[PDB]
């Protein structure tokens, strides 16, 4: 391993380097020697003070002071750092006296709108002042800054960081004094404190303080009032600040608290900016704000936000809108609505001309988006879409409009009606409230229309308690990894009891036809494929709640090998989805219980390797206990013996498996 | 009052939305400059609506344009650029509408049009994705202005033309959308005129090698475009940005073969110093696009060795730049060519015993450093 001879050789090399004198370089060498230790530093300070007059030397000294401050956070390095212990603050007063002596000096609030020439000089000067204050050991610093010229602090944002260094949360008086000083500076010189750069820096510092400690943003009523007064400025009201305003909106969204910014307002601001980067950044900020609060106001408006605009696409503002729509599609909430918005924005043609702008082919394409999501306003591909369109219109109230369209569609109304009769009776049942292969396919289409385009896009977790058996299956899908009261964006229709009647009708229809396990298998596979594997989280959870409710209405005949097998395949697909993995874990167990007597086994053993032990832990532990019971049930007979499930479940459960079973 | 100053600036921008007649407005120009002296951008009294009004005022004034009024328009454009709040697509459209009448009678060398060019470049920076038609029109106008400046012999004019051309994805799109390859040849000729102008005493040598703090393939500045993201990252430290100005002037035609540079390398092998420098600047980014034979790479390495053996500083530096491009090349160099480059790097290291021959280590940094995939033995 490491040897003390190497350390001694390194120390000798450091001493030899110290012998070879190389002002700033000598100071850096002295700092390196001091770090290697855990005097020469005083000699280096004297050498620097011999030429402390030059501005470049002063900037170099400030950079060295910043590096020395970084040594407490270098080599992890925030805490228990190697360099923090390597560099001791003891006996540094002699070497810091010359630095402090050199530190003495003896319009907009930003030096330059763009990359200022040598703004690092002012930043390092502020950092060196902070380092001198720290090496000495906050109202004194605030008073000194107030007495100091405005341009000195305005050159670099680090001074604001120095204001963040002071304990605003611990001592609200310091923050109040800083706010009063800023107000006095604004009154004396309007432009000095009226620049968006300084206000944005102060707001960012306040947000960082709030995020770091819970003390900040509390008892800051005066600070909030000052922030509102700053927002009351003409530029702030008119958003004269675009990258800065977008950053401020993003910071506000990241920071739950009362402010002048809202999610809908953030989306409107994102759409207002014609810059693609600013709009994309604001959309990313909104998405970060998503998954932590109700996004109904945004998810509902996502569907109509995107529309076809060739003229705007020439200006590529519509291109930025399409990018925002794609981002919202990547967002969980209202995946179907996002797909509908993307389809509306797209022209359904010239895909190669678009050439996948902003990075579709198979699943994100408008064809697959329309397949997964169908929206009603209420060439060959044109007719293919028009088939479902006329199905929707005959399913809608505008019967005469549908008839006129069909007359203009070169298709007889009765010709489509012959197969659309099931949807006709389905939505007639829907309209009323509180009241052989062809026929089988018709009833299948009716069941699918009950499943899709009728079930609530925001389905409540709680279900009807009409049937005690329904409560039984609700328990079977809620005992493992169940999260209740799961809401979504929009509710098209809710509390459809008629589905239960359908469960009664199919068993008695055409001597049991359309109630076969096969037809319900086709329906469930159709809905699962309609759930594209690339769809977002919220739509996946909604579809999962739908199919779980349908398996609740399912009869014991769905316990056959193929039916239950496709069910567990869909359940594993849900488990792959992270958010819906919770529901899938619960919905699996009953289907394993139904399959195990019928499996009497290679398929069961192969699907046994579906655990979450690789890639809410208490719910997983409960499901692991349930699975331990299940695998013991499978083991007691051990007819095939190829499961090898006891050790497999023991390893993930973190229970020490015994050698014998191993 | 400073808020009153910003209010007066907004009022002047609103007034400038009209054609302002035929009045010289020299006193008005001085007042506008004084207003822009404080809180030009940076103020709580200016408005983003006022910023849009100022942009429309600049467009209308440029439409009505054609001395003091030129300086006033330059100040208005500078203030509008200082206004960070502006719709990128709308700004680009207004800039193109103004640039129509601006190019009806334009003077690129004049500093009054320089702020207008800067505003157009700021609009086109975000207008590459948004409103590419007005951006393409502005790019064509900027290319014409760059050719006109390259006709002049001023080194600063050549640097400004190179910067305006790089102000470069728009230029690449225009080249891809150019009417024919003859337009690309004309652009190459204009860049050759720019290099000839840079050959004057007011500009440094065009070989552009041994750049200060040039960390090859390390950080950035390899292809100068995010989309390309090529290898061989050449870095300048302004000790070198002074050489990097001429490097970009050469890359105005080196970056794009005008980049199938196989036949271009075959036909351009005139052994000239300027030609060698241009080829060296081209190779690092156009090696893969050229898809030249390994024999061509070996011949380029041999030519670099021959030019480095020459006592001329310019020829040796161009050879060093070519060797640096070869060491980190977008195309796979021949094993014999790699060994020759290694020998050249060894000779450079031997010459590094003398302090004059820093330059040797900076030249072929990817060769000086452990280049990836090279045989360790």
CA distance A200 to A241: 9
Cα separations in angstroms, B171 against A380, B136, B168, B184, B256: 40, 8, 5, 11, 10
**Phi, psi (rounded to 5 degrees) for A451:** -70, -45
- List CB contacts of A368: < 8 A, sequence separation 6 or more: A360, A362, A532
Q: What angle do CA A54, A59, A63 make, to 5 degrees?
A: 145
Question: Cα dihedral angle (A9, A15, A20, A24), rounded to 10 degrees?
Answer: 120
Contacts of B6 in chain A (CB under 8 A): 190-191, 194
DSSP classification of residue A556: G
Contacts of A281 in chain B (CB under 8 A): none
Number of H helices, E strands in chain A: 37, 0
Across the interface, whether the CB atoms of B132 and A316 are under 8 A apart is answered yes
Long-range Cβ contacts of B222-231 (<8 Å, 24+ apart): B222/B284, B222/B285, B223/B255, B223/B285, B224/B166, B224/B168, B224/B248, B224/B251, B224/B255, B225/B168, B225/B169, B225/B172, B227/B169, B228/B285, B230/B284, B230/B285, B230/B288, B230/B330, B231/B284, B231/B328, B231/B329, B231/B330
CA-nearest residue to B38 within chain A is: A107
CA distance B358 to A132: 37
Question: Cα dihedral angle (B196, B197, B199, B201), rounded to 10 degrees?
Answer: 160
Helix runs in A137-220, H state only:
139-147, 150-155, 158-165, 172-188, 190-194, 196-212
Q: Which of A199, A235, A359 to mutate to test the interface with B (most CBs of B within 10 A)?
A: A235
Across the interface, whether the CB atoms of A241 and B85 are under 8 A apart is answered yes
DSSP classification of residue B259: -
CA atoms within 13 A on the CB side of B108: 25
B79 touches chain A (CB under 8 A): no
B133 touches chain A (CB under 8 A): yes
Estimate to the nearest angstrom the gap between the alpha carbon of B258 and the chain centroid.
Answer: 17
Q: Closest CB to B43: pick one of A191, A239, A242.
A: A191
DSSP classification of residue A662: -
Q: Closest CB to A234: pick one of B47, B93, B131.
A: B47
A644 Rama class: left (phi>0) / alpha (psi -120 to 50) / beta: left
Residue A393 host element (H or E): helix A380-395
Across the interface, whether the CB atoms of B47 and A274 are under 8 A apart is answered no
CA atoms within 13 A on the CB side of A105: 4
Across the interface, whether the CB atoms of B131 and A315 are under 8 A apart is answered yes
Contacts of B91 in chain A (CB under 8 A): 274
Contacts of B44 in chain A (CB under 8 A): 190, 194, 230, 233-236
Across the interface, whether the CB atoms of B43 and A189 are under 8 A apart is answered no
CB contacts < 8 A, A to B, total 129
* Unique residue bearing structure tokens 């001597």: A511
Pair A256, A264: CB distance under 8 Å: no
Contacts of A320 in chain B (CB under 8 A): 129-130
| CB atoms inside a 10 Å sphere around CB A88 | 12
Pair A588, A568: CB distance under 8 Å: yes
Q: Which of A240, A281, A282, A309 to mutate to test the interface with B (most CBs of B within 10 A)?
A: A240
Structure tokens at A424: 């006709």
CA distance B286 to B223: 9
B47 touches chain A (CB under 8 A): yes
Q: Closest CB to A107: pick one of B38, B49, B126.
A: B38
Please give the full DSSP string across A242-300, using - where no structure is assigned: -HHHHHHHHHHHH-----S--HHHHHHHHHH---HHHHHHHHHHHHHHTTSS--HHHHH
Sign of CA dihedral A156, A160, A162, A164: negative
Q: What angle do CA A560, A562, A565 make, to 5 degrees?
A: 100
CA distance A401 to A394: 9
**Phi, psi (rounded to 5 degrees) for A472:** -65, -50
Across the interface, whether the CB atoms of A191 and B46 are under 8 A apart is answered no
Q: Reduced to 3 states, what is the DSSP secondary structure of residue A546?
A: helix
Pair A86, A35: CB distance under 8 Å: yes
CA-nearest residue to A229 within chain B is: B44
B91 touches chain A (CB under 8 A): yes
Helix axes B181-198, B273-290, angle to 10 degrees: 140
Structure tokens at B13: 């921008």
Resolution in A: 3.6
Helix runs in B16-154, H state only:
26-37, 48-64, 68-82, 88-104, 113-127, 132-151
CA-nearest residue to B4 within chain A is: A190
* Unique residue bearing structure tokens 């609060």: A293
Cα Rg of chain A, angstroms: 34
Contacts of B2 in chain A (CB under 8 A): 107, 189-192, 194
B44 touches chain A (CB under 8 A): yes
Structure tokens at A413: 């109304």
Question: Cα dihedral angle (B166, B137, A323, A271), rounded to 10 degrees?
Answer: 110
CA-nearest residue to B1 within chain A is: A190
CA max distance for chain A: 107
- List CB contacts of A618: < 8 A, sequence separation 6 or more: none
DSSP classification of residue A71: G
């Amino acid at each position: 391993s490491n040897h003390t001879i190497d350390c001694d050789s390194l120390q000798n090399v450091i001493k030899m380097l110290e012998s070879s004198i190389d002002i700033s370089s000598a100071s850096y060498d002295k700092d390196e020697l001091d770090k290697e230790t855990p005097f020469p530093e005083v000699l280096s300070f004297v050498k620097s003070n011999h030429s402390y007059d030059p501005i470049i030397n002063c900037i170099s000294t400030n950079l060295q002071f910043t590096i020395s401050d970084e040594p407490k956070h270098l080599r992890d390095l925030i805490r228990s750092t190697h360099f923090r212990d390597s560099n001791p603050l003891k006996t540094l007063v002699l070497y810091i006296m010359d630095m402090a002596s050199k530190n003495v000096f003896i319009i907009r609030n930003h030096q330059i709108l763009g990359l200022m020439e040598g703004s690092l000089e002012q930043i390092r000067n502020t950092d060196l002042f902070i380092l001198q204050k720290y090496i000495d050991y906050h109202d004194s610093l605030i008073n000194i800054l107030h007495l100091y010229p405005i341009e000195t602090f305005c050159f670099g944002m680090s001074a604001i960081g120095a204001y963040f260094l002071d304990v605003a949360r611990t001592s609200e008086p310091i923050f109040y004094k800083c706010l009063e000083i800023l107000a006095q500076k604004i009154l004396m010189n309007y432009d000095y404190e009226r620049d968006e750069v300084y206000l944005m820096i102060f707001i960012k510092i306040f947000q960082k303080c709030v995020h770091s400690k819970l003390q900040f943003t509390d008892a800051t009523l005066k600070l909030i009032v000052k922030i509102t007064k700053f927002i009351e400025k003409v530029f702030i009201e008119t958003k004269f600040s675009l990258s800065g305003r977008q950053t401020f909106l993003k910071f506000i969204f990241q920071l739950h608290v009362y402010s002048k910014f809202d999610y809908q307002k953030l989306i409107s601001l994102t759409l207002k900016d014609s810059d693609v980067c600013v709009i994309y950044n604001f959309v990313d900020d909104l998405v970060i704000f998503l998954k932590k609060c109700d996004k109904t106001l945004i998810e509902g408006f996502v569907l109509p936000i995107l529309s076809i605009k060739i003229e705007k696409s020439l200006y590529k503002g519509f291109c930025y809108l399409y990018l925002t729509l794609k981002v919202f599609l990547s967002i969980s909430s209202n995946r179907s609505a996002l797909l509908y918005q993307l389809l509306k924005l797209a022209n359904s043609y010239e895909t190669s001309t678009i050439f996948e702008p902003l990075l579709s082919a198979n699943i994100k394409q408008l064809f697959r988006i329309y397949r997964l999501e169908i929206f009603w306003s209420f060439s060959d591909f044109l007719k293919e879409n028009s088939d479902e369109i006329i199905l929707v219109l005959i399913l809608t109230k505008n019967i005469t409009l549908a008839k006129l369209i069909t007359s203009r569609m070169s298709v007889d109304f009765s010709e489509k009606y012959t197969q659309l009769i099931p949807v006709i009776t389905t939505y007639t049942h829907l309209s009323e409230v509180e009241n052989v292969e062809l026929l089988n396919r018709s009833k299948a289409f009716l069941f699918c229309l009950e499943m899709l385009k009728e079930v609530k896009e925001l389905g409540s977790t709680f279900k009807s308690i009409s049937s005690t058996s329904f409560k039984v299956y609700s328990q079977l899908t809620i005992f493992a990894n169940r999260v209740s009261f799961n809401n979504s964006t929009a509710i098209p229709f809710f509390s459809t009891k008629s589905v239960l009647w359908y469960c009664n009708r199919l068993f008695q229809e055409l001597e049991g036809f359309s109630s076969i396990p096969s037809v319900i298998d086709l329906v469930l596979r159709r809905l699962a494929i309609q759930l594209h594997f690339a769809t977002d989280e919220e739509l996946q959870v909604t579809i999962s709640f739908r199919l779980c409710a349908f398996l609740c209405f399912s009869d014991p005949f769905i316990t056959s090998n193929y039916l239950v097998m496709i069910v567990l395949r869909i359940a594993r697909q849900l488990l792959s989805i992270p958010c819906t993995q919770s529901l899938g874990l619960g919905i699996a167990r009953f289907h394993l219980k139904k399959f195990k007597p019928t499996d009497f086994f290679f398929q069961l053993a192969e699907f046994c390797m579906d655990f979450l032990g690789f890639c809410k832990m208490e719910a997983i532990q409960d499901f692991y206990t349930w699975f331990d019971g299940y695998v013991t049930a499978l083991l007691n007979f051990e007819y095939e013996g190829y499961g090898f499930l006891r050790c497999q479940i023991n390893f993930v459960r973190s229970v020490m498996t015994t050698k014998n079973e191993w | 009052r400073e808020p009153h100053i910003l209010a007066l600036l907004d009022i002047i921008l609103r007034h400038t939305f009209t054609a302002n007649g035929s009045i010289c407005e020299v006193v008005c120009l001085n007042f506008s400059k004084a207003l822009r002296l404080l809180l030009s951008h940076h103020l709580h009294h200016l408005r983003f609506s006022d910023w849009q009004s100022l942009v429309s005022y600049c467009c209308q004034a440029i439409e009505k344009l054609s001395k003091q009024e030129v300086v006033e328009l330059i100040y208005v454009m500078r203030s509008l650029v200082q206004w960070y709040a502006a719709p990128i697509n709308f700004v680009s459209e207004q800039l193109l509408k103004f640039f129509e009448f601006f190019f009806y009678a334009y003077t690129e060398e004049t500093d009054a049009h320089l702020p207008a060019l800067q505003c157009l470049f700021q609009l086109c920076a975000y207008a590459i994705p948004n409103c590419n038609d007005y951006s393409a029109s502005v790019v064509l106008l900027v290319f014409k202005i760059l050719i006109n400046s390259d006709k002049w012999k001023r080194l600063d004019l050549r640097l400004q033309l190179i910067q305006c051309l790089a102000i470069y994805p728009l230029w690449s799109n225009s080249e891809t959308w150019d009417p024919h390859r003859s337009i690309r040849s004309f652009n190459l000729d204009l860049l050759n005129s720019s290099f000839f102008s840079l050959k004057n005493f007011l500009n440094f040598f065009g070989k552009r090698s041994s750049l200060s703090l040039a960390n090859f393939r390390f950080h950035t500045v390899e292809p100068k475009n995010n989309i390309a993201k090529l290898y061989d990252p050449r870095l300048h430290l302004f000790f070198f940005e002074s050489y990097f100005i001429y490097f970009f002037l050469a890359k105005l035609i080196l970056l794009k073969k005008t980049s199938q540079i196989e036949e271009l390398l075959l036909q351009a092998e005139l052994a000239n110093i300027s030609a060698s420098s241009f080829s060296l600047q081209l190779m690092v980014i156009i090696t893969a696009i050229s898809d030249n034979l390994t024999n061509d790479d070996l011949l380029s390495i041999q030519k670099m060795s021959l030019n480095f053996t020459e006592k001329k500083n310019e020829l040796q530096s161009w050879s060093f730049f070519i060797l640096f491009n070869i060491c980190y090349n977008k195309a796979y160099s021949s094993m014999l060519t790699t060994s020759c480059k290694k020998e050249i790097l060894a000779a450079a290291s031997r010459g590094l015993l003398n302090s004059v021959t820093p330059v040797c280590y900076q030249i072929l940094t990817y060769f000086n450093m452990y280049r990836p995939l090279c045989f360790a033995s």
